[PDB]
Amino acid sequence: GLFGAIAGFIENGWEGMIDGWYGFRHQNSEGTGQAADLKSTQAAIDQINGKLNRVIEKTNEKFHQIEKEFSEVEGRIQDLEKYVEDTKIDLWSYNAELLVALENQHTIDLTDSEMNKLFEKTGRQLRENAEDMGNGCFKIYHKCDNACIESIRNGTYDHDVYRDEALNNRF
Amino acid sequence: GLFGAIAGFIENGWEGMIDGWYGFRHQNSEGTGQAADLKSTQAAIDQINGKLNRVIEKTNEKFHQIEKEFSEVEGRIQDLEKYVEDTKIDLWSYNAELLVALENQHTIDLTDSEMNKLFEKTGRQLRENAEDMGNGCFKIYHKCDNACIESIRNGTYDHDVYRDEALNNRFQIKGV
Amino acid sequence: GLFGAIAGFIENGWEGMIDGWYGFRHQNSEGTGQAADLKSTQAAIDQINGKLNRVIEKTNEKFHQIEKEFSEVEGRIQDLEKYVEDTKIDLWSYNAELLVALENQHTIDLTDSEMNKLFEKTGRQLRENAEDMGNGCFKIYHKCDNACIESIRNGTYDHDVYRDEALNNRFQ
Amino acid sequence: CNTKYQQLARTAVAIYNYHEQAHLTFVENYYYITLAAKIGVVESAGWTGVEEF
Amino acid sequence: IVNVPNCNTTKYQQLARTAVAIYNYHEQAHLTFVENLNCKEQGNYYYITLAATDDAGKKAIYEAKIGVVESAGWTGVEEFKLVGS
Amino acid sequence: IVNVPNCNTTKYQQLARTAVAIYNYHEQAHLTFVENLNCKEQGNYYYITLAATDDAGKKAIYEAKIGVVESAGWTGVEEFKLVG
Amino acid sequence: PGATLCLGHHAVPNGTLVKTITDDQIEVTNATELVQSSSTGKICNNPHRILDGIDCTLIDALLGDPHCDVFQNETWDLFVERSKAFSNCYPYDVPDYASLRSLVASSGTLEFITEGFTWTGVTQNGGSNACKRGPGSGFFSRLNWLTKSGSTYPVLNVTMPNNDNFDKLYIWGVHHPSTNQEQTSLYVQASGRVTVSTRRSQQTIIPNIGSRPWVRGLSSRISIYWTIVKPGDVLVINSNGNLIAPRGYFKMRTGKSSIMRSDAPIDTCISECITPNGSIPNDKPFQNVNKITYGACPKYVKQNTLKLATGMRNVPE
Amino acid sequence: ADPGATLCLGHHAVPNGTLVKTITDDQIEVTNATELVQSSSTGKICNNPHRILDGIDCTLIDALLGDPHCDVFQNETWDLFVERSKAFSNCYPYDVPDYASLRSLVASSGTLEFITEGFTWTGVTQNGGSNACKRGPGSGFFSRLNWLTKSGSTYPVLNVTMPNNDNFDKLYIWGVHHPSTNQEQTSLYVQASGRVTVSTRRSQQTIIPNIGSRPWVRGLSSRISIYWTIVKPGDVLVINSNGNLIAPRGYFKMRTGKSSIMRSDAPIDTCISECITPNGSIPNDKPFQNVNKITYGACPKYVKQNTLKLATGMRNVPE
Amino acid sequence: PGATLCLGHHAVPNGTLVKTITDDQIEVTNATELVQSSSTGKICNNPHRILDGIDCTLIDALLGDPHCDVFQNETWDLFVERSKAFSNCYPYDVPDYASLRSLVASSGTLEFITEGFTWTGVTQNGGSNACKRGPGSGFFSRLNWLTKSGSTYPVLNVTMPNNDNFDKLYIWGVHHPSTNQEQTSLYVQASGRVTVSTRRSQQTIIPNIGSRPWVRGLSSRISIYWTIVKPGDVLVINSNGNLIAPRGYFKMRTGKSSIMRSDAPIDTCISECITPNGSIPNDKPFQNVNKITYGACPKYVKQNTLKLATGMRNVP
Numbered sequence A: 001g002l003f004g005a006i007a008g009f010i011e012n013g014w015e016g017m018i019d020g021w022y023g024f025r026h027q028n029s030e031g032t033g034q035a036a037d038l039k040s041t042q043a044a045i046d047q048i049n050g051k052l053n054r055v056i057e058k059t060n061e062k063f064h065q066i067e068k069e070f071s072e073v074e075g076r077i078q079d080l081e082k083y084v085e086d087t088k089i090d091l092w093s094y095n096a097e098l099l100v101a102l103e104n105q106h107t108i109d110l111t112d113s114e115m116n117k118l119f120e121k122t123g124r125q126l127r128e129n130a131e132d133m134g135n136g137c138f139k140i141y142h143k144c145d146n147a148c149i150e151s152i153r154n155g156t157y158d159h160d161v162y163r164d165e166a167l168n169n170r171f
Numbered sequence B: 001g002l003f004g005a006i007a008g009f010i011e012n013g014w015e016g017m018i019d020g021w022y023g024f025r026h027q028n029s030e031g032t033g034q035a036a037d038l039k040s041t042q043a044a045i046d047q048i049n050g051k052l053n054r055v056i057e058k059t060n061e062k063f064h065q066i067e068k069e070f071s072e073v074e075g076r077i078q079d080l081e082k083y084v085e086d087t088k089i090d091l092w093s094y095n096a097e098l099l100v101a102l103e104n105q106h107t108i109d110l111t112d113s114e115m116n117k118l119f120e121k122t123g124r125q126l127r128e129n130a131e132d133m134g135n136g137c138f139k140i141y142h143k144c145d146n147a148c149i150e151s152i153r154n155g156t157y158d159h160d161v162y163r164d165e166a167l168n169n170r171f172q173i174k175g176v
Numbered sequence C: 001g002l003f004g005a006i007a008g009f010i011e012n013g014w015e016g017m018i019d020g021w022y023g024f025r026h027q028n029s030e031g032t033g034q035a036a037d038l039k040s041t042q043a044a045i046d047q048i049n050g051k052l053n054r055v056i057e058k059t060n061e062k063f064h065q066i067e068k069e070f071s072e073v074e075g076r077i078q079d080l081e082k083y084v085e086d087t088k089i090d091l092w093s094y095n096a097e098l099l100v101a102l103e104n105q106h107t108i109d110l111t112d113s114e115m116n117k118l119f120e121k122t123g124r125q126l127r128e129n130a131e132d133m134g135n136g137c138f139k140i141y142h143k144c145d146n147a148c149i150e151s152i153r154n155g156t157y158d159h160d161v162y163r164d165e166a167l168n169n170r171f172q
Numbered sequence D: 001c002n003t004k005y006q007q008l009a010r011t012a013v014a015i016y017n018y019h020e021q022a023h024l025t026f027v028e029n030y031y032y033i034t035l036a037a038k039i040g041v042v043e044s045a046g047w048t049g050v051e052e053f
Numbered sequence E: 001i002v003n004v005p006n007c008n009t010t011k012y013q014q015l016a017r018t019a020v021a022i023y024n025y026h027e028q029a030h031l032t033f034v035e036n037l038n039c040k041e042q043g044n045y046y047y048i049t050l051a052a053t054d055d056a057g058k059k060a061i062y063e064a065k066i067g068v069v070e071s072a073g074w075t076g077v078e079e080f081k082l083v084g085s
Numbered sequence F: 001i002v003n004v005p006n007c008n009t010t011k012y013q014q015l016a017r018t019a020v021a022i023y024n025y026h027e028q029a030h031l032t033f034v035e036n037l038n039c040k041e042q043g044n045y046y047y048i049t050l051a052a053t054d055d056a057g058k059k060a061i062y063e064a065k066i067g068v069v070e071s072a073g074w075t076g077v078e079e080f081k082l083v084g
Numbered sequence G: 001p002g003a004t005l006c007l008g009h010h011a012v013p014n015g016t017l018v019k020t021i022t023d024d025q026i027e028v029t030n031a032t033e034l035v036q037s038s039s040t041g042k043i044c045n046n047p048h049r050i051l052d053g054i055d056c057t058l059i060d061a062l063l064g065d066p067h068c069d070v071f072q073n074e075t076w077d078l079f080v081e082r083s084k085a086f087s088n089c090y091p092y093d094v095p096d097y098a099s100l101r102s103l104v105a106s107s108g109t110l111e112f113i114t115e116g117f118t119w120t121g122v123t124q125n126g127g128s129n130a131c132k133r134g135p136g137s138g139f140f141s142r143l144n145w146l147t148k149s150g151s152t153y154p155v156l157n158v159t160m161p162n163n164d165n166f167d168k169l170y171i172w173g174v175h176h177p178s179t180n181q182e183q184t185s186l187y188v189q190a191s192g193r194v195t196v197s198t199r200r201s202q203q204t205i206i207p208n209i210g211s212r213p214w215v216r217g218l219s220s221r222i223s224i225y226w227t228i229v230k231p232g233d234v235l236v237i238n239s240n241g242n243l244i245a246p247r248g249y250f251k252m253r254t255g256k257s258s259i260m261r262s263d264a265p266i267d268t269c270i271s272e273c274i275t276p277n278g279s280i281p282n283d284k285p286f287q288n289v290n291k292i293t294y295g296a297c298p299k300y301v302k303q304n305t306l307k308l309a310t311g312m313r314n315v316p317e
Numbered sequence H: 001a002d003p004g005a006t007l008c009l010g011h012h013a014v015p016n017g018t019l020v021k022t023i024t025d026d027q028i029e030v031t032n033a034t035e036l037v038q039s040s041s042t043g044k045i046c047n048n049p050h051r052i053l054d055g056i057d058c059t060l061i062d063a064l065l066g067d068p069h070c071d072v073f074q075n076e077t078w079d080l081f082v083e084r085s086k087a088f089s090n091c092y093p094y095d096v097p098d099y100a101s102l103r104s105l106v107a108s109s110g111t112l113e114f115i116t117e118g119f120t121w122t123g124v125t126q127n128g129g130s131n132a133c134k135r136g137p138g139s140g141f142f143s144r145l146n147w148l149t150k151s152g153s154t155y156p157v158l159n160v161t162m163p164n165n166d167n168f169d170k171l172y173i174w175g176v177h178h179p180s181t182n183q184e185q186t187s188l189y190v191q192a193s194g195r196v197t198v199s200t201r202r203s204q205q206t207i208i209p210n211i212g213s214r215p216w217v218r219g220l221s222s223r224i225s226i227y228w229t230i231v232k233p234g235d236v237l238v239i240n241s242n243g244n245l246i247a248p249r250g251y252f253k254m255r256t257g258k259s260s261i262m263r264s265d266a267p268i269d270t271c272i273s274e275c276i277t278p279n280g281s282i283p284n285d286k287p288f289q290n291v292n293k294i295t296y297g298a299c300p301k302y303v304k305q306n307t308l309k310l311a312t313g314m315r316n317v318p319e
Numbered sequence I: 001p002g003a004t005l006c007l008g009h010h011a012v013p014n015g016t017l018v019k020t021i022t023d024d025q026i027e028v029t030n031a032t033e034l035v036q037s038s039s040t041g042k043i044c045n046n047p048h049r050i051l052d053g054i055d056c057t058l059i060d061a062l063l064g065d066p067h068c069d070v071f072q073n074e075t076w077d078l079f080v081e082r083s084k085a086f087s088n089c090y091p092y093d094v095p096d097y098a099s100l101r102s103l104v105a106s107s108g109t110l111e112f113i114t115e116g117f118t119w120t121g122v123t124q125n126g127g128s129n130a131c132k133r134g135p136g137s138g139f140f141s142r143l144n145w146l147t148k149s150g151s152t153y154p155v156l157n158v159t160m161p162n163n164d165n166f167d168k169l170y171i172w173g174v175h176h177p178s179t180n181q182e183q184t185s186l187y188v189q190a191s192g193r194v195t196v197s198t199r200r201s202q203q204t205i206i207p208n209i210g211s212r213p214w215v216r217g218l219s220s221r222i223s224i225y226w227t228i229v230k231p232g233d234v235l236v237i238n239s240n241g242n243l244i245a246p247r248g249y250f251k252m253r254t255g256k257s258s259i260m261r262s263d264a265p266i267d268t269c270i271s272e273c274i275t276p277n278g279s280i281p282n283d284k285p286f287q288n289v290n291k292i293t294y295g296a297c298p299k300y301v302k303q304n305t306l307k308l309a310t311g312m313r314n315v316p
């Protein structure tokens, strides 16, 4: 993707995460855990649903048209009737092919973007208390129990509480 | 947006900034202030103007065509004349709908990108003299008067001048 | 571009780099050097080739159609024959114009993205041993001979080996 | 003479019930039939008509 | 017993003016109708003798043969001959 | 007025050769024109007596009636009868 | 020590391949099909009023072929013509058949109003054994075969004003006998003529006497023509022979009616989109079943599948 | 110690945002947008820079034939001929088979320039008129047609020829008269059945008149049927008739170009506008329009949507 | 004393300008052209079977104009009509010429099969000096000019059923004399009539008598008509004068054949795409050469150039 997270600096996906599209895995003194992130998951789902509803919106209702199959040879007028319908079909076939190609390229990029945004947002929470390991994980340089991990996942983590401990361990 | 700045880590916009699209607000020893950034504003304006001029470029001139309203029932030839015009209108209606949807999605993303570019460029100027507060603001760890803020906004800020002062303030920890 | 690397915080390109699309220039104790990066070059080339092959894919074969030039004035049916062909040409001309404009905008953005990805990847290798100078270059705060520069370019650079040396130069 | 001939007569009575909006019921180049309750045929054209009734 | 038409009626004056106009159109002349002298209806045809002056003010006498076929709405000047002054 | 015509003039030979070709086409025969013997014009018609051989070289005498309607550009062989 | 926090995204074991601008096949977690490529094979009878022609074409029901009598005064949203249809009346042709079929199909009704035409000097209601209605002879229910009365066929000069607020469709015909004596036996005159006119238009047909192929016993033919009389106009029929006269007019309407050729059976279901292959769902924006459709339908495209990605790139372990 | 400094990056916003459509959002607020669909009109047709010819009471065909109340249109030219719904015919009742094609080709030609030619009609009476087609207080006829009838008691076989020695195409308009009775037929043309044959080296047309009663139009049951023939440079016009010929007086000069015809009741005004619709002229700054699918000139393309807003600013996020 | 590591990208001294969504022109390192705008000017004779009409239109080769005899039983994928073509037989016209030319071109063959028509009571094989075949008079090879025999022209009434499994195309005509004397001299009856019918269709043509302009010395004309007989149907021809009779049928086919007007010479080369200007390669998806094409061709567009970016932004 354009942002380098999905199929990028994140090596692979998590088949074990079945309750969200993006989330956190942690390791601390009390063990390991996993939690999906709701806001980033919902942002990707809302964009794709909106794109999908615009695409499948029923907007074509036609009634009496032109004939398109013929049992006898007629020449000029039938040549034109066939050419008109063949021209229409090719233009709509082109529209449909380009549409799914543009939409899919954008869907892969927007979901890549949401992953990168969540990563950058998390690193901004940790400030000088953590370092980017380059593989989607942060090394946190202070004791961080379950309540501390939960404060990162719900966005209330105050970096200043742990800064003195973290700066000392880092340097 | 795709980049997470506008309607993202920047909480909202500034209605009071009426002389540019992007800019700086500061708080230092001399007070508070506000200044628009010219280069980033002009880059967004130039891209949208270029996109807009391509969309409204007058490119359609037709003269004698086919009839499109009919006062009598005729059957085959009139069926085809109406079908041809209905086919054309639907394809152009689709083109017009798709064009504005793609353009608008891209306009929102390019203006988001310009905001993110200006933020990243500012943080690269400050180097180790400042920290990203996570809401679009930098905490600058030294005395930085109006002339100092001006040097950041016009790209002449020399980080080595303040690095010793800034590193000292940044790495104050608790002593026991 | 959307990502700010090419024609952005990287001031210009290298005409002297003839063996790849992206690469490294370094200066260390042993002198200066230049080397292309293969993965990022190949990733951009693969995307453009895939896009190019998709566009030039032969997909149109027509045989007996309608007449399109006329030597006599006939009126109604000839008006429609001309209008049908004129309508088709304008719709395909629009398709062709929009296609190249979208493709080119995306090609410029994807190549900008590949430059930015390689930059972000390199800074993540160096961790706390280097600083971003803001122009696409990293200042590395330890002795890094040719073997050390190569370890960065082939992805084996172990930052812990130099961290103590680098932190000392960086902050004192 | 009350055969063919019976279908020709009922055909004449039905055409009469259409033309005059009456409701009769049959009892018993040209055919002249006297019935109780004038037909032409041209076999090359397949035409059959009741000229008089 | 004999019924003689009035040559100064609207119908006959208009037939003569039409006859003068057709002559002017066909011969690129400019006669002006003055008055009818005699007139006769026989079958589909009217026979009118009229006076007409030219741009020089000279009056002359002309004989017109005018056909009218009512079912076709047709009126035609078949003859327009100068007779004298 | 007595006229002794040359029945082997270019005009008359072409009228006869055309007649032989029409006969060969219509009857799937293969006569070959040799010469005209007598010739006569009467109204819209030429009456020509000609000799023609078959593939075995057997000569026979034929009488042809050829019509011409110039205003229509029409030329037609109405009769082509073996005499002996 | 410290702690480790890893950001990540989900994945599935069973991905789906999709097309993008750059990749011909790339695996995502989910996709939805955009091309309707299947049908039940059956035409649903709701919500469009379907009318099965069975053995009858729309024109045969229009003219009044006896085995098409059941369709009198019928209406439809969609008329379905079966390939097994046949004619079983007087042999005929329709110059501009496709247009008459089209305009009647678009009107969506066969409502017929008998009008009091007066035919003085001719005998009416001619029939044929090529067009049996029951045991005996018959004719098209909506047409009146006029022949000589006594020893003469006078000039017919009838008028019919249109004092209504709708268009009237008149269907009339011209009889082409096969021999000269057949022409004179029926219509006296050596050459007939039919001139039907309004204030807007005139149509003159001269019959054509000659032998045609044997069809249901007959070498003769009838040519069918039509005339629309707008409100405030008047119909005028003029003939000195060979007139197959109308008995009235068909009321004309505008709307969404049409006609379709299909051999698919009618079923008891609900579907807005109809194709000759049967009804198809319209939840997808494109379809690959048939370019012929009727109703709220997906647009026809050449592709039999187009997968729209509905999830991120799928990167399993 | 010192408090240091804070430097905040931001972007502008407005209190009057505009909703626009995107790929993902049906409505999203941006700071500014511009309309791409022209949906209004002044209701008037601007008379510049296109030459507008107002037909008023006259259709193009009636001005072509020379209906007396359409005399003012003789030799007229136009870029756009405007036909009003109040137009009416007031000459001999007629019809034109393929009326639409003749109206199209004349409208596309853009001129009614007529050139009289010296036809010689030996043995017939010329210039027949009608009280159904008055020019002045008396009877008249189409100015460009010549009603031929018998002279004396005969109507000869007409055989006239007009070669085209010029380097342009000639348009000949001619007609055939359909009487109501046999007496009417023989009174005008002697022969019991007429015939009109008009031919070139490349084409021929033969029309047989029809005798019978049509509905009354302006007192008449008879009709004239209008036909046309185009003669290319180097070809020749031949007219052959033994009755019922409504003869041409000459040809119309043929041109190719940008001219056309439009049906409208919009008044014509003194303004400038490149684009014309039946509803009136519309500006052409926007690439799309919703006013009418019938347009003439440099016009936005017709679309079904009545609005399509193009975003011209960033996302609007008020305080 | 440390090290510096700079990230960069390449650049070229010969960039190419391309269009984008935002920029009318912007410089990239490389681009490829998407609009084919040139042609060799020659029509390649492979892989399509090209039939060069030279002096003959398709209709004249169909009817059998003598100088078009060489095209008898010919087949083609593309028939090429030259602007120098000319007719040199009896002056004629074809109502719906465009339709007949179209359906024969789409059929792709002139395969003619002679049938045993019996014309009792008339003179067959009428010819004309306006249609010489050799030094003598002639006529269209596929038509049969019938005239009176003796002093009578009977009512012709022949029948030809179609028992084969393909469609038959019958070409026939009606003769339009110039004078009444010409009419009665050829056909006795003062007014002719031609009625051609199947079980599904019928056509009756009444000849026209009158003076037309001279074409190759003649004021009379032949009008060409056509009838298709489906398998199981039957052809009936009925006439009492002026019939230009068919000699048989043309075999009808469906397929990929067509016709094109071009003055481009034909050459021994390979090209899938054909235009009146000549063949063009089809590697590019669009072309600006001609809206008339045949085969696997780029789509016609109005633009003469459309450059597709194939490299990054060029910043020297």
Ligand SMILES: *[C@@H]1O[C@H](CO)[C@@H](O[C@@H]2O[C@H](CO)[C@@H](O[C@@H]3O[C@H](CO)[C@@H](O)[C@H](O)[C@@H]3O)[C@H](O)[C@H]2NC(C)=O)[C@H](O)[C@H]1NC(C)=O
Binding pocket: G157, G158, G159, G234, G236, H213, H214, H215, H216, H221
């Ligand atoms: C064939 O029938 C038609 C219709 O019945 C006849 O046409 C009608 O003819 C009468 C008199 O010829 C017309 O009456 C006139 O009407 C005008 C205007 O309303 C009025 O001012 C007159 O005083 C007179 O009453 C009538 O309008 C006309 N109708 C139509 C539809 O044409 C026609 O005459 C018949 N054919 C023959 C040969 O008689």
Ligand SMILES: *[C@@H]1O[C@H](CO)[C@@H](O[C@@H]2O[C@H](CO)[C@@H](O)[C@H](O)[C@H]2NC(C)=O)[C@H](O)[C@H]1NC(C)=O
Binding pocket: A146, A147, A148, A150, A151, A154, A156
């Ligand atoms: C964010 O997470 C923190 C960490 O768990 C939450 O703080 C705890 O909240 C629970 C309430 O369920 C209390 O019982 C604990 O005593 C809290 N612990 C601490 C250290 O404060 C916090 O409530 C969460 N906030 C939100 C908005 O979800």
Ligand SMILES: *[C@@H]1O[C@H](CO)[C@@H](O[C@@H]2O[C@H](CO)[C@@H](O)[C@H](O)[C@H]2NC(C)=O)[C@H](O)[C@H]1NC(C)=O
Binding pocket: G211, G212, G213, G214, I157, I158, I159, I234, I236
């Ligand atoms: C003209 O020819 C047709 C066909 O040869 C004749 O039609 C046949 O007529 C007989 C009885 O007359 C029928 O049994 C056949 O079935 C008919 N065949 C076809 C193909 O129609 C027709 O009779 C002839 N007409 C004349 C006047 O002789």
Ligand SMILES: *[C@@H]1O[C@H](CO)[C@@H](O[C@@H]2O[C@H](CO)[C@@H](O)[C@H](O)[C@H]2NC(C)=O)[C@H](O)[C@H]1NC(C)=O
Binding pocket: C052, I030, I031, I032, I310
């Ligand atoms: C410029 O672009 C062209 C095509 O966009 C490049 O040439 C293509 O290279 C691929 C490599 O796999 C081949 O498959 C194609 O056949 C080549 N096409 C042509 C037309 O050569 C080319 O390498 C690029 N660079 C330069 C300097 O031209």
Ligand SMILES: *[C@@H]1O[C@H](CO)[C@@H](O[C@@H]2O[C@H](CO)[C@@H](O)[C@H](O)[C@H]2NC(C)=O)[C@H](O)[C@H]1NC(C)=O
Binding pocket: H159, H160, H161, H236, H238, I211, I212, I213, I214, I215
């Ligand atoms: C009718 O007029 C045409 C004029 O087109 C006459 O045709 C000319 O006939 C003479 C000999 O009769 C030829 O030399 C000319 O070349 C012909 N002219 C053209 C243009 O073809 C025709 O003869 C006349 N017919 C009658 C019966 O008078």
Ligand SMILES: *[C@@H]1O[C@H](CO)[C@@H](O[C@@H]2O[C@H](CO)[C@@H](O)[C@H](O)[C@H]2NC(C)=O)[C@H](O)[C@H]1NC(C)=O
Binding pocket: C069, I037, I038, I039, I276, I277, I288, I289, I290
């Ligand atoms: C291909 O041929 C066509 C026509 O044979 C050329 O188009 C003509 O170009 C000339 C001069 O530019 C114009 O005067 C004509 O009006 C054009 N005709 C049409 C129908 O447009 C075309 O330029 C040729 N193209 C090439 C590449 O040879």
Ligand SMILES: *[C@@H]1O[C@H](CO)[C@@H](O)[C@H](O)[C@H]1NC(C)=O
Binding pocket: B147, B148, B150, B151, B154, B156
């Ligand atoms: C940048 O701002 C500083 C402080 O106001 C000023 O001294 C310097 O000249 C400025 N440079 C530029 C290039 O504007």
Ligand SMILES: *[C@@H]1O[C@H](CO)[C@@H](O)[C@H](O)[C@H]1NC(C)=O
Binding pocket: C146, C147, C148, C150, C151, C154, C156
């Ligand atoms: C990477 O480069 C170093 C430096 O020379 C070398 O020793 C090492 O073998 C290389 N490893 C790989 C995997 O390329």
Ligand SMILES: *[C@@H]1O[C@H](CO)[C@@H](O)[C@H](O)[C@H]1NC(C)=O
Binding pocket: G030, G031, G032, G033, G310
């Ligand atoms: C995935 O696609 C299927 C089929 O299109 C759909 O039913 C489902 O809602 C989508 N989402 C998930 C999470 O399965």
Ligand SMILES: *[C@@H]1O[C@H](CO)[C@@H](O)[C@H](O)[C@H]1NC(C)=O
Binding pocket: G037, G038, G039, G276, G277, G288, G289, G290
């Ligand atoms: C629909 O019917 C047509 C023939 O009418 C056939 O070619 C096509 O394959 C059918 N499609 C399906 C999905 O049955």
Ligand SMILES: *[C@@H]1O[C@H](CO)[C@@H](O)[C@H](O)[C@H]1NC(C)=O
Binding pocket: H032, H033, H034, H035, H312
């Ligand atoms: C916003 O766009 C409108 C066009 O709809 C324009 O009139 C106006 O000047 C623009 N305002 C700004 C601030 O760009």
Ligand SMILES: *[C@@H]1O[C@H](CO)[C@@H](O)[C@H](O)[C@H]1NC(C)=O
Binding pocket: H039, H040, H041, H278, H279, H290, H291, H292
């Ligand atoms: C234009 O005129 C048409 C036809 O009268 C009408 O349907 C349409 O609403 C009008 N539109 C405008 C914008 O006036």
